[PDB]
Amino acid sequence: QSSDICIVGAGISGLTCASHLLDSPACRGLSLRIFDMQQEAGGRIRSKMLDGKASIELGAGRYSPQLHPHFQSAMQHYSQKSEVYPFTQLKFKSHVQQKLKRAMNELSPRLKEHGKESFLQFVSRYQGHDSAVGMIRSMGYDALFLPDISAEMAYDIVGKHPEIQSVTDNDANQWFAAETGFAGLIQGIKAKVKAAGARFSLGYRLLSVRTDGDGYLLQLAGDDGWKLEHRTRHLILAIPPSAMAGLNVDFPEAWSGARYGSLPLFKGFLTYGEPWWLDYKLDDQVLIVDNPLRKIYFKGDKYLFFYTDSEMANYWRGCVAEGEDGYLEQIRTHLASALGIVRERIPQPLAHVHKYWAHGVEFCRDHPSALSHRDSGIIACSDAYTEHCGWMEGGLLSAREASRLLLQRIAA
Amino acid sequence: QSSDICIVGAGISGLTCASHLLDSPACRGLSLRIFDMQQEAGGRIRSKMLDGKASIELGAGRYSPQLHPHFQSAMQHYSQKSEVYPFTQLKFKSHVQQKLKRAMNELSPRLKEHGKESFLQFVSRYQGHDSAVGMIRSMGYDALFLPDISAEMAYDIVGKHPEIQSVTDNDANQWFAAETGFAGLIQGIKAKVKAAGARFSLGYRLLSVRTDGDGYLLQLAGDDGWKLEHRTRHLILAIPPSAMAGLNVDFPEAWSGARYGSLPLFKGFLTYGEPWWLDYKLDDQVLIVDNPLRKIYFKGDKYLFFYTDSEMANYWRGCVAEGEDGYLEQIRTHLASALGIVRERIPQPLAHVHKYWAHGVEFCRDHPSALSHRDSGIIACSDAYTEHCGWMEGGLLSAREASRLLLQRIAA
Numbered sequence: 001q002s003s004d005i006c007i008v009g010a011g012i013s014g015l016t017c018a019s020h021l022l023d024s025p026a027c028r029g030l031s032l033r034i035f036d037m038q039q040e041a042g043g044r045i046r047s048k049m050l051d052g053k054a055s056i057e058l059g060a061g062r063y064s065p066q067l068h069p070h071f072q073s074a075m076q077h078y079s080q081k082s083e084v085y086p087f088t089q090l091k092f093k094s095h096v097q098q099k100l101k102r103a104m105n106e107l108s109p110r111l112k113e114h115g116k117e118s119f120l121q122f123v124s125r126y127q128g129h130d131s132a133v134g135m136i137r138s139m140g141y142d143a144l145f146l147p148d149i150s151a152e153m154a155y156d157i158v159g160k161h162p163e164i165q166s167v168t169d170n171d172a173n174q175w176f177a178a179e180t181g182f183a184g185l186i187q188g189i190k191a192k193v194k195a196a197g198a199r200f201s202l203g204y205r206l207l208s209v210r211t212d213g214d215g216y217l218l219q220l221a222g223d224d225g226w227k228l229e230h231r232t233r234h235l236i237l238a239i240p241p242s243a244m245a246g247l248n249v250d251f252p253e254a255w256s257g258a259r260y261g262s263l264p265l266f267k268g269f270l271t272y273g274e275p276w277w278l279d280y281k282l283d284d285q286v287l288i289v290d291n292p293l294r295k296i297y298f299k300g301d302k303y304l305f306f307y308t309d310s311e312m313a314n315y316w317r318g319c320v321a322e323g324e325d326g327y328l329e330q331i332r333t334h335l336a337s338a339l340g341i342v343r344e345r346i347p348q349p350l351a352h353v354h355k356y357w358a359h360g361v362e363f364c365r366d367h368p369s370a371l372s373h374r375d376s377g378i379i380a381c382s383d384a385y386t387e388h389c390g391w392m393e394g395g396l397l398s399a400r401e402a403s404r405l406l407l408q409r410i411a412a
Numbered sequence: 413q414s415s416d417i418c419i420v421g422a423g424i425s426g427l428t429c430a431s432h433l434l435d436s437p438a439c440r441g442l443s444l445r446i447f448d449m450q451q452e453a454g455g456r457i458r459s460k461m462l463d464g465k466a467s468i469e470l471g472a473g474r475y476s477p478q479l480h481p482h483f484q485s486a487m488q489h490y491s492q493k494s495e496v497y498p499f500t501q502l503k504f505k506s507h508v509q510q511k512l513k514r515a516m517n518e519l520s521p522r523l524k525e526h527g528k529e530s531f532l533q534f535v536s537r538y539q540g541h542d543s544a545v546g547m548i549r550s551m552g553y554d555a556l557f558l559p560d561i562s563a564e565m566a567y568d569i570v571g572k573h574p575e576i577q578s579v580t581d582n583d584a585n586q587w588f589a590a591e592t593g594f595a596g597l598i599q600g601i602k603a604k605v606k607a608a609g610a611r612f613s614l615g616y617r618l619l620s621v622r623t624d625g626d627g628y629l630l631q632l633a634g635d636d637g638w639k640l641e642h643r644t645r646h647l648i649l650a651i652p653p654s655a656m657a658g659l660n661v662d663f664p665e666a667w668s669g670a671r672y673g674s675l676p677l678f679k680g681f682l683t684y685g686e687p688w689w690l691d692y693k694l695d696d697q698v699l700i701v702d703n704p705l706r707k708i709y710f711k712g713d714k715y716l717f718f719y720t721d722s723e724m725a726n727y728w729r730g731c732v733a734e735g736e737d738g739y740l741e742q743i744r745t746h747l748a749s750a751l752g753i754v755r756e757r758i759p760q761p762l763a764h765v766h767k768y769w770a771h772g773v774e775f776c777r778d779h780p781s782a783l784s785h786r787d788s789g790i791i792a793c794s795d796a797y798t799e800h801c802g803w804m805e806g807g808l809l810s811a812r813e814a815s816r817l818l819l820q821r822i823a824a
């Protein structure tokens with residue numbers, strides 16, 4: 001139970017690490033072991049079949065070739081078919097939405113000086129606090145209110161999310177989703193590294209790690225309690241900052257000078273006996289509302305879903321904890337108040353699924369695509385270390401840098 | 413986020429507790445909350461569908477109406493069909509098996525003065541250590557060799573297990589299994605307590621508990637990380653001693669004067685394209701072998717499985733951790749040597765499932781059917797607190813007493 005190279009984390013970053021490493025002739029003859037505390041690879045990529053009828057994305061769901069060329073290239077590399085992602089339009093702009101577009105354009109020259117303060121305080125410079133609250137609310141992302149989200153970061157959030165990208169004049173970017181779910185890409189990469197000799201040990205959580213001569217000694221625990229020790233010569237931790245902080249490896253202090261934050265996310269998918277929303281011409285439309293649903297998506301004639309973050313992600317999760325009955329009834333109420341129709345005219349769902357991610361988004365509050373432990377030479381890999389914080393593209397960028405660093409260590 | 417009565421643990425014990433409590437008129441109008449860290453109820457009762465062709469028992473799998481009258485009463489009370497459990501035959505005892513039968517009989521009077529020493533040392537009085545090892549090994553239960561397992565406990569283990577009960581002249585006891593799996597009983601009890609107003613919160617693990625005036629404050633965590641606080645006036649911890657030690661309740665010192673132990677268990681089921689074992693007339697037979705499989709069961713022409721405990725349970729779990737391929741080739745190697753045939757005359761399995769229980773059996777090292785905390789009044793319910801420690805009957809006995817103690821607290 002040992003290896004030459006070990007990767008902890010079978011998300012898109014770790015699987016892509018193993019892919020680069022196994023493509024290099026420098027790794028010929030070296031064993032490679034991949035761990036993940038979950039029984040299936042993918043991480044924050046989780047595709048599911050809603051009532052066995054349609055494919056849905058409980059995790060990452062959309063991408064843009066203009067923003068994410070490495071992801072586009074990976075979809076092609078593994079012959080994954082893409083489809084148009086329709087939730088990019090915002091023609092029915094409200095007064096507050098048009099006001100924010102104008103305010104952000106008018107305030108942009110002030111980013112050099114005040115770009116580091118919270119987005120809320122930055123927008124408050126336009127017409128006051130109250131006006132800023134109403135403007136920011138109309139974007140549907142509650143993270144924009146948080147004091148740890150600076151003005152610069154918020155311009156990045158607005159300009160990069162398909163529903164609100166027109167607010168910073170990024171209409172040109174196209175958006176696509178996986179025809180069969182991004183899980184097909186995960187499996188394509190897993191099958192690729194497995195065929196190249198990589199061995200997978202799924203269902204094992206890394207608890208601690210120590211230096212052991214020229215290598216490392218890992219302590220893992222299976223999901224059923226089975227304790228396990230693994231010795232390796234090279235170690236990549238393809239896990240996000242929230243997980244790094246639990247391994248007692250002095251993260252982030254001994255890995256970088258930046259600080260890192262995270263945000264919870266919540267998605268709920270509902271399907272019905274009939275596409276009742278067609279009576280309102282809402283198919284392929286997204287509604288942003290000052291309502292706990294926040295963002296409401298109607299996928300053609302198949303289903304609907306909502307997507308929330310920060311305070312509202314916790315709202316729906318706490319609501320879920322009180323029981324599924326009250327949860328579905330709350331959705332019914334908020335759908336009526338959001339669409340302006342009598343609650344009794346909103347039918348009950350035929351089937352539904354929801355997912356809560358305590359750390360759905362992890363972001364840097366300020367450089368290298370991958371990190372090196374000051375004290376041991378372990379490598380850290382995550383989208384949080386790149387210019388694409390919170391996106392799969394960032395995971396691909398980090399994996400490339402992490403594998404380059406390791407091959408450098410190998411040739412040392 | 414509160415209740416009058418809270419039960420942690422949705423095994424047969426906790427569910428039975430709720431049934432008794434809800435049958436009492438003193439609980440009319442009181443709210444009942446049931447937590448469990450698993451997403452499904454049942455605990456160590458886990459039924460599954462092997463290749464979608466036959467129901468198997470990854471946990472508890474059989475019972476005897478002579479040893480377990482309360483469990484048969486529950487099966488009947490919930491209209492659960494039973495079927496004959498065939499693995500009771502020991503008609504052609506081997507020399508060392510016959511010798512252990514005679515030894516345990518002759519040494520029986522020595523139990524009063526020496527019954528508390530280890531079974532191995534106790535049996536060594538007959539013909540020495542080597543002869544004792546040969547005899548004990550032929551029972552198929554590695555627990556019989558443990559120093560913590562006294563002679564009194566061993567006599568109970570041999571006389572209460574179907575495969576070897578005839579070694580202590582308990583051949584009269586009948587054995588039965590569930591026609592659809594014991595999960596049908598769990599579902600029956602769950603549906604009943606649910607209809608009576610009990611509300612379930614599955615997927616939540618209790619982390620700590622502290623007194624709060626006349627009630628208690630429970631800190632729980634969902635399987636997705638969601639932190640939850642719950643307040644109750646009356647609490648039952650229907651969890652085993654191993655799970656009690658992980659809490660902040662001063663277990664066991666503040667609950668009883670006895671200590672507790674546990675043993676790991678492992679089951680593995682395999683299905684094939686053909687019932688190849690019929691060529692050897694092994695259907696409905698069980699083989700006990702000086703071989704890592706230990707106990708090999710052939711269920712008619714449907715499937716086969718093996719059952720191990722103690723070091724052999726850990727042997728198979730470590731073997732599983734090294735890879736599925738190595739795990740299945742090891743079974744094939746051991747089946748060949750156990751039947752006296754060549755490895756290549758044993759086909760590869762068509763499908764298989766296994767389960768490792770880190771604490772499959774939990775027992776007392778030496779009285780009340782349920783325990784109570786000295787100060788807080790929290791009640792503890794588990795089979796390990798009864799004369800049937802390690803059996804579902806013990807859970808029913810503990811539940812009855814635990815419900816009794818809680819009702820005494822309600823009416824105080």
Ligand SMILES: Cc1cc2c(cc1C)N(C[C@H](O)[C@H](O)[C@H](O)COP(=O)(O)OP(=O)(O)OC[C@H]1O[C@@H](n3cnc4c(N)ncnc43)[C@H](O)[C@@H]1O)c1[nH]c(=O)[nH]c(=O)c1N2
Nearest residue numbers: 009011012013037043044060061062205206243360391392
């Ligand atoms: C709801 C929602 C919605 C979106 C997104 C996320 C979420 C939650 N994302 C972001 C995207 O999911 C994310 O950027 C990448 O999946 C990150 O992949 P990584 O492999 O870097 O981490 P990721 O978190 O995916 O994987 C880390 C892996 O490490 C494992 N692990 C962690 N700690 C461990 C330990 N101690 N021991 C063993 N294993 C451990 C985990 O089990 C996990 O599988 C996204 N991106 C995008 O491009 N477009 C989009 O539309 C979205 N939308």
Ligand SMILES: Cc1cc2c(cc1C)N(C[C@H](O)[C@H](O)[C@H](O)COP(=O)(O)OP(=O)(O)OC[C@H]1O[C@@H](n3cnc4c(N)ncnc43)[C@H](O)[C@@H]1O)c1[nH]c(=O)[nH]c(=O)c1N2
Nearest residue numbers: 421423424425449455456472473474617618655772803804
């Ligand atoms: C392989 C194998 C084979 C057998 C058996 C066990 C095993 C593992 N048994 C024994 C039988 O399974 C056992 O005696 C009872 O099912 C135990 O029921 P309890 O509800 O008391 O505990 P059990 O362990 O079943 O339930 C406890 C529950 O509490 C939950 N829990 C624990 N800690 C928690 C926390 N901190 N927060 C939230 N939830 C928590 C657990 O998830 C679990 O669901 C058996 N018996 C028999 O009569 N005949 C047989 O043939 C067998 N064979």
Ligand SMILES: C=C(Cc1c[nH]c2ccccc12)C(=O)O
Nearest residue numbers: 141143157161309361389390391
């Ligand atoms: C890719 C994401 C995730 C995400 C990145 N930055 C955020 C800021 C706030 C809320 C979600 C995100 C998305 O499609 O929302």
Ligand SMILES: C=C(Cc1c[nH]c2ccccc12)C(=O)O
Nearest residue numbers: 553555569573721773801802803
């Ligand atoms: C009911 C059980 C569980 C059990 C009780 N005591 C034991 C000692 C050794 C191995 C298993 C058990 C069984 O069917 O083996």
